[PDB]
Amino acid sequence: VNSFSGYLKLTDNVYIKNADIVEEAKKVKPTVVVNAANVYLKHGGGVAGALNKATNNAMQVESDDYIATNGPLKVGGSCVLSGHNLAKHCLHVVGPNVNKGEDIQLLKSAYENFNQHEVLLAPLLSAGIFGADPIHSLRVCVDTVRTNVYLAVFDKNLYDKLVSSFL
Ligand SMILES: OC[C@H](CN1CCCCC1)Nc1ncnc2[nH]ccc12
Ligand SMILES: [Cl-]
């Protein structure tokens, strides 16, 4: 039993809700919130910009030190950093950005990072401003993640479209 509320159950392990991931994380304080990151951990917009804003830029400050030490992430890769005031940990995961010409096949590799954590609050990777098809992102999530994932979908029409089209 966990403290996630109001989710629709899609499979044995994948749950979905229409919600702002920032507000969800503040309420639940999950062990892990997933950020839709880029390789430079520059949290400018989308989920990343919103999560960073909610930390009063502390996420960005921590991220800049991470990059200065380690260099950029790989597309499809991840790192674990602090969750600040939102969660215990933030798993920064880089899905391919179609608006940069990155290979969509890397979306499966990106979701594989979730399997290192028993329970996660997450967005749909490569959706939104990353330019991929969200129906596809959900399909890959369900077919790749085996741990318990609580998906927060920002947009209501998308959420309803995602639920109504789910196989
Ligand atoms: O897939 C990621 C989605 C993309 N979404 C954005 C709205 C329009 C349709 C596409 N972004 C978010 N998902 C959950 N919480 C969020 N907080 C801020 C952004 C955000
Ligand atoms: Cl977005």
Side-chain angles (χ1 to χ4, degrees), residues 83-146:
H84 300 277
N85 52 317
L86 303 176
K88 187 171 194 286
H89 306 285
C90 179
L91 181 69
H92 295 272
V93 181
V94 183
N97 190 324
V98 180
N99 302 316
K100 298 178 177 175
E102 291 169 351
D103 187 8
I104 195 60
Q105 310 300 309
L106 291 168
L107 186 54
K108 187 173 185 75
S109 301
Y111 275 117
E112 288 170 342
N113 295 285
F114 289 25
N115 290 321
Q116 301 294 317
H117 302 277
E118 289 199 329
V119 184
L120 314 87
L121 172 61
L124 284 169
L125 298 178
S126 296
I129 68 176
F130 278 62
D133 178 1
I135 293 168
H136 179 64
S137 183
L138 176 57
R139 192 68 258 167
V140 180
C141 181
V142 162
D143 293 341
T144 305
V145 181
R146 298 177 301 282

Side-chain angles (χ1 to χ4, degrees), residues 2-132:
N2 56 53
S3 55
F4 288 102
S5 176
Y7 286 78
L8 178 67
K9 182 169 178 60
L10 295 174
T11 68
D12 179 73
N13 66 298
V14 179
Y15 297 80
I16 194 165
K17 180 182 182 179
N18 173 218
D20 180 350
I21 193 170
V22 170
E23 290 311 316
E24 274 290 284
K26 282 195 286 189
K27 181 72 173 186
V28 175
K29 311 226 199 306
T31 302
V32 179
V33 66
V34 174
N35 182 31
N38 58 51
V39 298
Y40 307 109
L41 303 177
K42 291 303 183 195
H43 309 303
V47 168
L51 292 174
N52 178 58
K53 178 178 175 186
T55 75
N56 184 42
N57 211 50
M59 177 179 285
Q60 191 64 67
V61 171
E62 177 194 34
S63 293
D64 288 352
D65 171 82
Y66 173 92
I67 297 286
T69 297
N70 301 109
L73 295 181
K74 299 169 179 178
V75 180
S78 71
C79 66
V80 179
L81 291 172
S82 179
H84 300 277
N85 52 317
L86 303 176
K88 187 171 194 286
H89 306 285
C90 179
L91 181 69
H92 295 272
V93 181
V94 183
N97 190 324
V98 180
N99 302 316
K100 298 178 177 175
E102 291 169 351
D103 187 8
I104 195 60
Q105 310 300 309
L106 291 168
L107 186 54
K108 187 173 185 75
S109 301
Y111 275 117
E112 288 170 342
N113 295 285
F114 289 25
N115 290 321
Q116 301 294 317
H117 302 277
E118 289 199 329
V119 184
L120 314 87
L121 172 61
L124 284 169
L125 298 178
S126 296
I129 68 176
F130 278 62

